[PDB]
Amino acid sequence: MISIFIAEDQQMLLGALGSLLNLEDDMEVVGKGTTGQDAVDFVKKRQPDVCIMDIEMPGKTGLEAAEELKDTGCKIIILTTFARPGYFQRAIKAGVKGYLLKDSPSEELANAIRSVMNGKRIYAPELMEDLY
Amino acid sequence: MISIFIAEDQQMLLGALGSLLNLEDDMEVVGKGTTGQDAVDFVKKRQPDVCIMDIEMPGKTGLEAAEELKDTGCKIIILTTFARPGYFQRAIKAGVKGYLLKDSPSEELANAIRSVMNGKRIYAPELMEDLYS
Numbered sequence A: 001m002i003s004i005f006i007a008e009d010q011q012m013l014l015g016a017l018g019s020l021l022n023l024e025d026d027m028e029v030v031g032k033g034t035t036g037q038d039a040v041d042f043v044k045k046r047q048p049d050v051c052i053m054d055i056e057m058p059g060k061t062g063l064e065a066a067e068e069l070k071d072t073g074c075k076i077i078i079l080t081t082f083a084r085p086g087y088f089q090r091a092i093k094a095g096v097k098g099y100l101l102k103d104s105p106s107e108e109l110a111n112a113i114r115s116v117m118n119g120k121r122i123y124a125p126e127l128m129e130d131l132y
Numbered sequence B: 001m002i003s004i005f006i007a008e009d010q011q012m013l014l015g016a017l018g019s020l021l022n023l024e025d026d027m028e029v030v031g032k033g034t035t036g037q038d039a040v041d042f043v044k045k046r047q048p049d050v051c052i053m054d055i056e057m058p059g060k061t062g063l064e065a066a067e068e069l070k071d072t073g074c075k076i077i078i079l080t081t082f083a084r085p086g087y088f089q090r091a092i093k094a095g096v097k098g099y100l101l102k103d104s105p106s107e108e109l110a111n112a113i114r115s116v117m118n119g120k121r122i123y124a125p126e127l128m129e130d131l132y133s
């Protein structure tokens, strides 16, 4: 069973993502948060296998949270509206294992969690497609 | 069984919303769309009880779509990031039954669908605390 923490400031989306992932037999949402701090606190304390991280959240962004969790051993997958090369470069330098867009098909999220748990790096193809 | 069409351009969110609503025993997601036209086409043709409508979508907005569906008898609930007075007033003039924010708790969605089916007008308390001032 893969343990997942979800950090997403928009409650409707946070609740819907937890519901989308609890559909999976080999996955479990162990906690939900709305800020970068909620992610840092849970991940350092509860140590879930995976953290689904939104970027733009109040207080501390998901990129800032990812930097604070760089040496924790948790596999961070960024899930954001923003296809920004600066956000992506800061995310990869922080050691994130994935970077997905909120415009990626929903099925790609559970797939990315399994891939990342298998040591793979998952970046939405839509990113390169947006830039070029 | 309440039939619902969801129009949301962000696929991840569209898929997650359908999953959130298919959890309910008295509800059913009969279609999903990413544009305002997808909403107009499905609603006029398939006539679901309810349409969960995002505002900002490519091609045709959810408000432009809500206006085209004003006389269809489908109960439209707006679900958006935007607590914008102009969007709200255009939505209500189009005859939308609800206006929810993406910052409303996830439970507000299934509750609003049942309330709207019971002839009520549902506006997110978060929207009213911001705008009603």
Ligand code: BEF
Pocket (backbone or CB within 6 Å): A054, A055, A056, A057, A079, A080, A081, A082, A102
């Ligand atoms: F607000 Be998250 F970066 F989509």
Ligand code: BEF
Pocket (backbone or CB within 6 Å): B054, B055, B056, B057, B079, B080, B081, B082, B102
């Ligand atoms: F893009 Be929708 F108006 F949140």
Ligand SMILES: [Mg+2]
Pocket (backbone or CB within 6 Å): A008, A009, A010, A054, A055, A056, A057
């Ligand atoms: Mg956010």
Ligand SMILES: [Mg+2]
Pocket (backbone or CB within 6 Å): B008, B009, B010, B054, B055, B056, B057
């Ligand atoms: Mg949109």
